[PDB]
């Protein structure tokens, strides 16, 4: 009879919710991080409830059969191991008390089984990983190949350090390196660029550079970033390339590798980014999307005074004027938001009381509408409406502030969501935000549970070490900004790793608490959390988504203009006139000969283009000319060229608008859009998609306007601090507590300065900029730090005084960045699919030639097995034939290929000569046996060996390996070139690339890449033209700006190479905040408006904030749209090749 009551109390919502509530209290208790003494009995009653539930289900399931039907359940294993660990901790316990304490976090995984639906959600996630399998194999292979490439190229390059020249005490480099260990004496012997933890990387090449005078470059010491940034060993190369693939702080690896090795490795980073990062990330996205969408399809298909009161009420219902007063309230809402948006930090008292009376008047209007509608709508029938109950909550939260904090005042903004029923795009945004907590509420709950689990795990594991001694990761021996000592900071770190920011915290956590454990924790976080975030993103997306000689003259002009000779001549002159702008940099007072040659080729080009324009006129007619967008563009550009020509040749014209219109020469490359059909078709796609872009960007502007008004209310004028300009360190806030005291400090000493952040929330424009930085994740930390340090308007920030505005930024990221870029991507793919359905079902990024090549290439997806080969008549040759053809033979060959891969992997920097020579000889015997199997396969298949592409590739790689070893011989014999030696040794990775021949899963995704190469080439043409235009604009404006942060002698807009390097960096949104930071400054002492700049006549090292902001924001947005184009291309081609 005990089994009966046992099962009867088991199957009960009461018991279920009891377990749910106790585990929720246990999760709230796990975050204590230093639980008081009295919580021992609380954890005791927790484990008591757990054991009681466990024995209850034991009594209900087993009953002396060996808990068979109980443990046949996979979810009860969790509660069983939890009680095992709990009673082990209560009884005799190991010394790893904290390492088993962090095992009680699985009580938070119990929630997955206690709450309904979460078991099915995690089942779906585990099913999606089973599809991500093959792209994980492929990304492992690609990161290993590119890690061997990066290893070969930059082995030990990161160790370069500008070392002294005049060593006294008759000391040597080694005599110094054995005796010096603290960073100050390291700084007394190496360069150490005044504020860095690491020493300055130098270079032996002429472009990398540049050791100062008195310092020579040498590779001695540790790598940068505590030793974790390097290509020295294959494991560090694989880590740096995973960092490049996730683009986490990849701009710093970019800059470090270029400074150490040479700016010419821009090619290596371009290839790595534009293949590894982009293609592999989009492949992960495509396979997650295909898996989840086929899951969803299979799921749904397998599923399916009283009369005076009455007169007053009738009068009010009649006066509500259904067609009009709702529109009056809508325009009132718009006016109220645009009235709140005109708030800034420096406000006159007149403006202040104006805004005060305005918002009180608006809340009065809304309260009047509230009371009128309640009396007219019956209160029961009134609250019948969800919109009206929301209005009621808002008006109450507003009137609570009239005669009775800031965030509570920041809640009027939600009224602007009332525009939803009129605005279909805002309605789609509301629908997405509602599906997040509706049909996907369980997936959002799984995400929250995972983030909590990882936060508390990281806390329990590493928060002890962080406090044990930060003195490893901080010199003041205080906790860093991002630590794991508290639950809130540990959760902040887990959120930041959900964003792409894992490496900067992994370095510190490694240093304090062990590389193995920190790598395991952070890689679990990255993989699992990003998988579940991507699943949620794709789920929301897909759920929301589903004589008359004049006539002769005209004819001759027509034939001339449309002749292919004339067209090619015009394209050649366009390319010449465009490339002639690349030479006009700060080094143009040198090479005065080419300066003059370009100054005259300018006149030649504008004459040619004027003649082209006049011929086109006489050939087409003004009608069809001025009704052509391309002809209008060419006509505008030639008009600017002609105005500049006539002005400069006439003289008296080098004033203001003339020298400001000379800068518009950077638009001369735009004449190639009309000519190159590959760029023309992509521009047509972007133009066709631009209306939906404008709609969604309007909705996003309104949402970010809500968020920027909130941010202005929170942090309007609170980012001012008075740093000590020598080291740039905030004053301790004990002395100098406010602005009036810092000004006395500035009268006493000269090196203090009450300075702002230059990208802040002082008004709604700067707020929009700061939100763009926080939403792109590039520059957000310097904002968040001052935000959470904020105190008041004229008060010195205290360290993490707010500390919970981090919640403001978490909410903004989650809603603004995540949801609005979800809407962005969803509507853009929807628009591209509509365009593709319009275009007869053809691809919208490929021309006719490219479509023909695309079909002839897609035929290579053949499923038909070819005739193997005709066997020879000779007995020994037939024996050799079966020997080469046997599957055992080919798999043995693949095994030798993997062994070659491992032989290249075990290479590292600083190995002994015995190791180097044994590696030499292993590689030699590998090459000789590869050549042997090749030549025996040949003498078996003399004529038909070459009819196969993979056999041709085998022969090519054998040949290039042999010439690589022979060229190493000839180098040691005749030449000295280490760079060419490395770049030639790079050829042996061909043998590794033969692994693809057998792996069909990798072969299919590589075929997807080859399929997507044409459209990617067209989008790359357009992106390179945009990058060229922006590079010329950069060279013209942003040269001579100060070299403050992100702009340095290596990377700047001084020359075309530097400018295109910074622009390729920005194309991935990386470091654009740093590049824009020295441009945003003006108004001394941020700059100097009259600087001499020897070697040139231009003065002043200040940038124009207006053109700087426009330049960088527009490049960010245009690069976003073109990489979205590339992402659509790869998604669609992977869909195609995966279906077939």
């Amino acid at each position: 009879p005990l089994r009966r009551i046992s099962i009867k109390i088991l199957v009960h919502s009461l018991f279920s919710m009891l377990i749910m509530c106790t585990i929720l209290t246990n999760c709230i208790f796990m975050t204590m991080n230093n639980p008081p003494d009295w919580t021992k009995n609380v954890e005791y009653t927790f484990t008591g409830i757990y054991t009681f539930e466990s024995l209850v289900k034991i009594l209900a399931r087993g009953f002396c059969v060996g808990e068979f039907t109980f443990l046949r359940d996979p979810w009860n294993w969790l509660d069983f191991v939890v009680i095992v660990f709990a009673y082990l901790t209560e009884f005799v316990n190991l010394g790893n008390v904290s390492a088993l304490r962090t095992f009680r976090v699985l009580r938070a995984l119990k929630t997955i089984s206690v709450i309904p639906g979460l078991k099915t959600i995690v089942g779906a996630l585990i099913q999606s990983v089973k599809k991500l399998s093959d792209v994980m194999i492929l990304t492992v292979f690609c990161l290993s190949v590119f890690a061997l490439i990066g290893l070969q190229l930059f082995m030990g390059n990161l160790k370069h350090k500008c070392f002294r020249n005049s060593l006294e005490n008759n000391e040597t480099l080694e005599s110094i390196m054995n005796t010096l260990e603290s960073e100050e004496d390291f700084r007394k012997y190496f360069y150490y660029l005044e504020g860095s933890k690491d020493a300055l990387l130098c270079g032996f090449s002429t472009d990398s550079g540049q050791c100062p005078e008195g310092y020579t470059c040498v590779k001695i010491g540790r790598n940068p970033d505590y030793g974790y940034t390097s290509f020295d060993t294959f494991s560090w190369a694989f880590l740096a390339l995973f960092r490049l693939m996730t683009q986490d702080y990849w701009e710093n690896l970019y800059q470090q590798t270029l400074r150490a090795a040479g700016k010419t490795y821009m090619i290596f980073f371009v290839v790595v980014i534009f293949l590894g990062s982009f293609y592999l990330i989009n492949l992960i996205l495509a396979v997650v999307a295909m898996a989840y969408e086929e899951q969803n399809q299979a799921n749904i298909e397998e599923a399916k005074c009283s009369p005076y009161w009455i007169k007053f009420k009738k009068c009010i219902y009649f006066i509500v004027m259904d067609p009009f007063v709702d529109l009056a309230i809508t325009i009132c809402i718009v006016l109220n938001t645009l009235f709140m948006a005109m708030e800034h930090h420096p406000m006159t008292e007149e403006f202040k009381n104006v805004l005060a009376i305005g918002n009180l008047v608006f809340t009065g209007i809304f309260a009047a509408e509230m009371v009128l509608k309640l009396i007219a709508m019956d209160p029961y029938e009134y609250f019948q409406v969800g919109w009206n109950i929301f209005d009621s909550l808002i008006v109450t939260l507003s009137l609570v502030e009239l005669f009775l904090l800031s965030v509570l005042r920041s809640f009027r903004l939600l009224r602007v969501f009332k525009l939803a029923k009129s605005w279909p795009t805002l309605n789609m945004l509301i629908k997405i935000i509602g599906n997040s907590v509706g049909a996907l509420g369980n997936l959002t709950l799984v995400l929250a549970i995972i983030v909590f689990i990882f936060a508390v795990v990281g806390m329990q594991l590493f928060g002890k070490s962080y406090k044990e001694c930060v003195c490893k990761i901080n010199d003041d021996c205080t906790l860093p900004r991002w630590h794991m000592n508290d639950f809130f900071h540990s959760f902040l770190i887990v959120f930041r790793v959900l964003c792409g920011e894992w490496i900067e915290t992994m370095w510190d956590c490694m240093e304090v608490a062990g590389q193995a454990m920190c790598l395991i924790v952070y890689m679990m976080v990255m993989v699992i959390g990003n998988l579940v975030v991507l699943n949620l993103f794709l789920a929301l997306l897909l759920s929301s988504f589903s004589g008359k000689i004049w006539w002769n003259i005209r004819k001759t002009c027509y034939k001339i203009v449309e002749h292919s000779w004339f067209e090619s001549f015009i394209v050649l002159m366009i390319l010449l006139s465009s490339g002639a702008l690349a030479f006009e940099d700060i080094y143009i007072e040198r090479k005065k000969t080419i300066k003059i040659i370009l100054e005259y080729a300018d006149k030649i080009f504008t004459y040619i283009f004027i003649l082209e324009m006049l011929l086109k006129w006489i050939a087409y007619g003004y009608k069809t000319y001025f009704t052509n967008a391309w002809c209008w563009l060419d006509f505008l550009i030639v008009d600017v060229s002609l105005v500049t020509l006539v002005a400069n040749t006439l003289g008296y014209s080098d004033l203001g608008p003339i020298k400001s219109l000379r800068t518009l020469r950077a638009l001369r490359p735009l004449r190639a859009l009309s000519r190159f059909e590959g760029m023309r078709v992509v521009v047509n796609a972007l133009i066709g998609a631009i209306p939906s872009i404008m709609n969604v960007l309007l909705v996003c502007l309104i949402f970010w306007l809500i968020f920027s008004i909130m941010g202005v209310n929170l942090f309007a004028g609170k980012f001012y601090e008075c740093i000590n300009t020598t080291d740039g360190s905030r004053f301790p806030a004990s002395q100098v507590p406010n602005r009036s005291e810092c000004f006395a400090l500035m009268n006493v000493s000269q090196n203090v300065r009450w300075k702002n952040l230059k990208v802040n929330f002082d008004n709604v424009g700067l707020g929009y900029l700061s939100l763009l930085q926080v939403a792109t994740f590039k520059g957000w930390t310097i904002i968040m730090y001052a935000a959470v340090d904020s105190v008041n308007v004229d008060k010195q920030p205290k360290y993490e005084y707010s500390l919970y505005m981090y919640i403001y930024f978490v909410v903004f990221i989650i809603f603004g960045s995540f949801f609005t870029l979800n809407l962005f991507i969803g509507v853009i793919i929807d628009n591209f699919n509509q365009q593709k359905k319009k275009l007869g079902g053809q691809d919208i990024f490929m021309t006719e030639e490219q479509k023909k090549y695309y079909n002839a290439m897609k035929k290579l997806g053949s499923k038909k097995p070819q005739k193997p080969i005709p066997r020879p008549g000779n007995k020994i040759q037939g024996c050799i034939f079966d020997l080469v053809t046997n599957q055992a033979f080919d798999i043995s060959i693949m095994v030798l290929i993997c062994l070659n891969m491992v032989t290249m992997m075990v290479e590292k920097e600083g190995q002994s000569q015995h190791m180097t020579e044994v590696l030499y000889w292993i590689n030699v015997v590998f090459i000789i046996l590869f050549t042997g199997e090749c030549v025996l396969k040949l003498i078996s298949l003399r004529h038909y060996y070459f009819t196969v592409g993979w056999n041709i590739f085998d022969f090519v790689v054998v040949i290039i390996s042999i010439v690589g070893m022979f060229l190493a011989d000839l180098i040691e014999t005749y030449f000295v070139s280490p760079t060419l030696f490395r770049v030639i040794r790079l050829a042996r990775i061909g043998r590794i690339l033969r692994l693809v021949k057998g792996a069909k899963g990798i072969r299919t995704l590589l075929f997807a890449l080859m399929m997507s190469l044409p459209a990617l080439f067209n989008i790359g043409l357009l992106l390179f033209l945009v990058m060229f235009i922006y590079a010329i604009f950069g060279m013209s404006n942003f040269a001579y700006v100060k070299k403050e942060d992100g702009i340095n002698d290596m990377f700047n807009f001084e020359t075309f190479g530097n400018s295109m390097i910074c622009l390729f960096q920005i194309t991935t949104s990386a470091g654009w905040d740093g590049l824009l930071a020295p441009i945003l400054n003006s108004k001394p002492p941020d700059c100097d408006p009259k600087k001499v700049h020897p070697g040139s006549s231009v003065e002043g090292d200040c940038g124009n904030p207006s053109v700087g902001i426009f330049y960088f924001v527009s490049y960010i947005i245009i690069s976003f749209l073109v990489v979205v184009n590339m992402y659509i291309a790869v998604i669609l081609e992977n869909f195609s090749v995966a279906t077939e």
Partner: protein, 120 residues
């Protein structure tokens, strides 16, 4: 307390060499000026401590008369090792040997205690 690993009791035959092995473990990297190690001897539990070896920028052997010249340092501190060697142990060497390690920047001071017993 600091993580210092020593044998609580060490039994050694008269006339043999006695390595007194202790393990000190702390985060960070040892600093020569920063790292300081002290060894003391007591004839009995309540007996006055006699320092016999120190590390202060180098090993300092105090050459206590009670040990003659039989004490040697036997450890590489950079390895968290601070062991000492007592050659040709004599019956009077029986007693308590204390290792004290203070390591900057670690504020805490480690302490290992070995009871050395001399057989017959």
């Amino acid at each position: 307390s600091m993580e210092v690993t020593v044998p609580a009791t060490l039994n050694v035959l008269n006339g043999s060499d006695a390595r007194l092995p202790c393990t000190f473990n702390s985060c960070y990297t040892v600093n020569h000026k920063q790292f300081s190690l002290n060894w003391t001897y007591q004839e009995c539990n309540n007996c006055s401590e006699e320092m016999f070896l120190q590390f202060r920028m180098k090993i300092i052997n105090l050459k206590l008369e009670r040990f003659q010249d039989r004490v040697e340092f036997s450890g590489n501190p950079s390895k968290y090792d601070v062991s000492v060697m007592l050659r040709n142990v004599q019956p009077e060497d029986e007693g308590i040997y204390n290792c004290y390690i203070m390591n900057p920047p670690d504020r805490h001071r480690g302490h290992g205690k070995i009871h050395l017993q001399v057989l017959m």
